[PDB]
Design a protein around this ligand. Structure first.
Ligand SMILES: *[C@@H]1O[C@H](CO)[C@@H](O)[C@H](O)[C@H]1NC(C)=O
Ligand SMILES: *[C@@H]1O[C@H](CO)[C@@H](O)[C@H](O)[C@H]1NC(C)=O
Ligand SMILES: *[C@@H]1O[C@H](CO)[C@@H](O)[C@H](O)[C@H]1NC(C)=O
Ligand SMILES: *[C@@H]1O[C@H](CO)[C@@H](O)[C@H](O)[C@H]1NC(C)=O
Ligand SMILES: *[C@@H]1O[C@H](CO)[C@@H](O)[C@H](O)[C@H]1NC(C)=O
Ligand SMILES: [Ca+2]
Ligand SMILES: [Ca+2]
Ligand SMILES: [Ca+2]
Ligand SMILES: [Ca+2]
Ligand SMILES: [Ca+2]
Ligand SMILES: [Ca+2]
Ligand SMILES: [Ca+2]
Ligand SMILES: [Ca+2]
Ligand SMILES: [Ca+2]
Ligand SMILES: [Ca+2]
Ligand SMILES: [Ca+2]
Ligand SMILES: [Ca+2]
Ligand SMILES: [Ca+2]
Ligand SMILES: [Ca+2]
Ligand SMILES: [Ca+2]
Lengths: 272, 38, 265, 265, 265, 272
């Protein structure tokens, strides 16, 4: 709504919305199969629910959704909850994969599809990128000139293109903004969409269960920001991790904030 | 390849003077005169 | 440009009616038809899509704004319908054996749902108001419910003997379940094949328009058996062919876009 | 001279800064470094202690005020650390496989704890606020906990079958356990080898300074995962020789002693 | 036009913003990238330099202003790094076994050093302030140091027996040595293979920009362990290829050049 | 600093900066192998050190630098000292070499590189010359007329060029300022750089140990100046020369002044 807001400074602080946002909201943890395996129990979910019930979160409000691995989760994350917590392990090989996962879930995207064989697309601003998901996306790019001819590449020979992605389940390609590129992609396995980044998704919350903070949300190498809903833990077990989560969940939900844009079950808005 | 052309224009905006500009804004700088000094 | 707030609006009655937005929204928006494989079968033409696009060109819509998206059957379309366009039209055939299925499809796509997940195994859920329902999708769903009493025991069903439960669905691709609102229910569902979500019904989705190409109007969008409404974007047609239907749609698309309004969310 | 009491104290803003306590605190205090066996092994000298003391002498610290106290390993040091010196420094090696151990060591020494005993067999303990934790020292601690409901029954475990308990520690020399705050836990520990105390966290210990000789800063002092702070007495260095490390420490000892502040107790 | 003089500058707060220097400073300046051999190896192309130059052409940097200067390894680049350009970008791979080498490199290039020569055989030197150090370059430097008391006698080392000296480096292609500032040291170096220079750290060179392509930020520029700062021109990327890295550098070169400022010296 | 300076004439002269500039500066002698040869000693450096220690220059301030040949020194001199002195033997067969060396180190140069094959260079003013360094620089040049054709030469035939140098280690080429010259140089063994001359270098002091003054710093044969940091000695030995230098070092440092432009270790600034 484009209309303006007004207020004052004599008004008083109203009562606490905590202990009611729990009653009228839902929470959803996303943990790894490694945790369930280390635990080797069946009623740990009911245990965590009966624990949450003391902190206020009622029985039918908490949810646990397993994901086999970081990349498997990155492939089409179907986050549909009023509060999402994600626990993600550290791996120097999956550093970029779990930075792209962050860039995807933390932020809200407006995605338009792409027709590669029939058209050739470009980028406009510093927030219009190309996100490709699927089993294995092997993307190659050849920039072109004003008269539709290759620059350091051959428009026919795919082996002369510049391979930016080699066998990656989730790729977020940023290229030079202003020039037309031609793309070679494994359309039979992966789908690639030109997505503009909107404001942040305040509904999710990442927790790096392992090493130091490495996630670089903003693709420019000058900011390197550390947002509110990006926590870090050191671990040797998972029960201690879940107990820490439960004991400090009110802070997590105080650092999160229900969305404003719209209701949607996808991790990105689709508007053709 | 405007992203940089606009910035060049906004760098050249105020360096231009005012008295001589008003002296030049009364001239019928027809096509020849407009594309001769280029 | 405030978001996530509701502010009072103002206006007047002296303002004049501005020029028409048709022939500008037709360019700055997108259109998406959904047709049945029976139509392409009866047609047997590989250029009907470009033909209809060139016909839309006369009515205003440009060439790269219209899309045709096939679907084999009403149920195979009901299974996870991911509608993402700016103006959606759906064609639907009449089949008394699919009355309730293609009424659930209508109640699903026409309306806008706020959907949270469900954990059958652990929790026993209940419906608060008349607009909280449980919608299940998948290849083949088999749902069985058991209400509970005040003391967490069954009422005509046993919390262990699943067979005692009451069967509301039998091998359905889409189900919309409304149960007595105010009692805790236990569920049994083959969650391997189907996913069930607890949804709340909100204001209608003004982006989609259903067109029943066949028999009389049976679609009861609202689950209460008192309204039985017929909305603006709920159309009916009589047919013996499909080229005539598509020509009708093309000639009366402006009426369709006038009966539809872009989303609010 | 009223001890044990806290009374309001006053001041002003017109006064002028007094002389430098530095160059006198060195003489009137004591220093105590904690280096690893690896360091003296790399050095392979028998007079490096007196060498560093003669060096310190140039910075002001007299001979019999500085002390060196070796430690075999990080866990063997964490097991009952007795830091009784008016200025303590610790050199700590980085290891990915020891991250939680060398973060618990930090949270245990950098902070001042008020610890009460704990009789597992006889009582059932809980936590009150976000600073009441359970600190377990010893050679090999294997801790298991079962949370309980209102009526002293189990929750996902059985109070008689120890195998049903939840394993939070597995053969660790130091653990700092935080559990949900407001529930009773029934514990099982190998109390022959490990002692567990119920400790509350007070304001920080400003008398000890940690120096991470290796990789990036990882020490999460705060049990709450949101903050992840980095205090003034948690320093970091990159190293290839321990002589270079010790020369750095000696050359910048004054900044360290400025980042540290004697105890109030 | 006074040179080597410093005088009071004056101004006011009513001034209009004069110009907008980007797209002119680019034309009238020169940029120089320093990439590793790994990148060209992964690329396997003989025209990628011209390609990147044509790309920069869009950003405004013309053809004969962008330069590339390969380097085999961090050590080979640290050996006498002759950075002579109006803007310098450096790509730097992460390796836990090279943290100190690639921190010394950062401390050397990022900062502007005033370096006098050193003659070890005759003279015994001492560091005056905290910004005075001894930087040794060459194929392989091996440094040993004996601090000395007031009567030019060793402390833990024998002036005649070099083996008694304390080793601070072992076949390093670049060392930056900081020792106790205020005592005279007798040195031993492989002078025939490597040269040591007594340097003083002035303010920072704003002409270079380091970009760690891999792991977390570890570069401890400041020798003292208390600050461990991180400037503007100390960047970090996560990578799995190099074409994406170069495209990112290109697309965000303007930010890099806003982070860099032409030299004052 | 474009801003101006103001002063007066009533102020009193301040105390002598001598006896402190020694402590806060360093001094570096450059001496030929002939000197160490005729000396035939190994402690002459410590002797001169302890002599400077009486003259007021402290122990860790003095440095020495053997240079095998005048040309070997001319090949990339690396001067980084707050005071430099250079003892230069006389040789009529090296007049132009040790005049070019003089013009190179006594003054301050701002240098850009040169790509002979990709470009054709020229001069702008009478101070924009081409300094070539290396082990054997054989240079040939063709001036081009108004219509990019050769004058007494051919753009294709290198034999027709005019050979200005012949197997030299340092050449300072000045040509007609205002015409485009094509070049041919042993780019493998020598690098040639287009340098503009700037305000002088008051940090060095040349001392010609032999015959009468010949050094023509100024490349035009009209000035023939003689500066203050250009000294001359008559010699039959070297120990007497070094004793002279020691006894009259204060005069040399009065004749010299620390640089003002910036810090650097070479004989010239590099600005691409
Ligand atoms: C807000 O809290 C105060 C203090 O607990 C209480 O008196 C008041 O009733 C609360 N507000 C409402 C609307 O109940
Ligand atoms: C900015 O413009 C003024 C005149 O408009 C000019 O004198 C000045 O040199 C310009 N700034 C720069 C950095 O060239
Ligand atoms: C709407 O129609 C009127 C009447 O022809 C015309 O004056 C007006 O410009 C039109 N609106 C626009 C936006 O062109
Ligand atoms: C404190 O410092 C001042 C200034 O340096 C000095 O005059 C005074 O003597 C010092 N105080 C003492 C007790 O020495
Ligand atoms: C300058 O020299 C005079 C005479 O030797 C002496 O009296 C005076 O103290 C000196 N100046 C200073 C600042 O010491
Ligand atoms: Ca990836
Ligand atoms: Ca190529
Ligand atoms: Ca981009
Ligand atoms: Ca159905
Ligand atoms: Ca029954
Ligand atoms: Ca109901
Ligand atoms: Ca531990
Ligand atoms: Ca707690
Ligand atoms: Ca259990
Ligand atoms: Ca090193
Ligand atoms: Ca020794
Ligand atoms: Ca030092
Ligand atoms: Ca010569
Ligand atoms: Ca000729
Ligand atoms: Ca000339």
């Amino acid at each position: 709504i484009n209309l303006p807001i007004t207020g004052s400074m004599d008004t008083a602080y109203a009562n606490s919305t905590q202990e009611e946002t729990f009653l009228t909201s839902t929470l959803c943890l996303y943990y790894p199969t490694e945790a369930a395996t280390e635990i080797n129990d069946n009623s740990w979910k009911d245990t965590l629910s009966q624990l949450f019930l003391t902190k206020g979160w009622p029985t039918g409000s908490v949810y646990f959704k397993e994901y086999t691995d970081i990349a498997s989760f990155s492939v089409d994350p179907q986050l549909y909850c009023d509060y999402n917590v994600v626990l993600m392990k550290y791996d120097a090989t999956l550093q970029l994969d779990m930075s792209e996962l962050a860039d995807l879930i933390l932020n809200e995207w407006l995605c338009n599809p792409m027709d590669i064989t029939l058209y050739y697309y470009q980028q406009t601003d510093e927030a219009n990128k190309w996100i490709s998901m699927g089993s294995s996306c092997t993307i190659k790019v050849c920039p072109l000139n004003t008269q539709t001819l290759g620059i350091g590449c051959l428009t026919t020979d795919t082996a002369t293109f510049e391979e930016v992605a080699t066998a990656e389940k989730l790729v977020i390609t940023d290229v030079v903004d202003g020039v037309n590129h031609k793309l070679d992609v494994t359309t039979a396995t992966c789908t690639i969409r030109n997505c503009k980044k909107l404001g942040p998704r305040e509904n999710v919350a990442v927790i790096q269960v392992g090493g130091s903070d490495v996630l670089d949300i903003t693709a420019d190498p000058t900011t390197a920001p550390q947002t509110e809903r990006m926590m870090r833990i050191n671990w040797k077990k998972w029960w201690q991790v879940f107990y820490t989560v439960v004991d400090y969940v009110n802070q997590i939900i105080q650092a999160m904030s229900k969305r404003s844009r719209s209701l949607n079950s996808a991790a990105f808005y689709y508007r053709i | 390849l405007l992203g940089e052309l606009r910035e060049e224009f906004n760098a050249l905006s105020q360096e231009i003077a005012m008295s001589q500009l008003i002296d030049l804004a009364l001239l019928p700088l027809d096509m020849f005169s407009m594309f001769s000094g280029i």
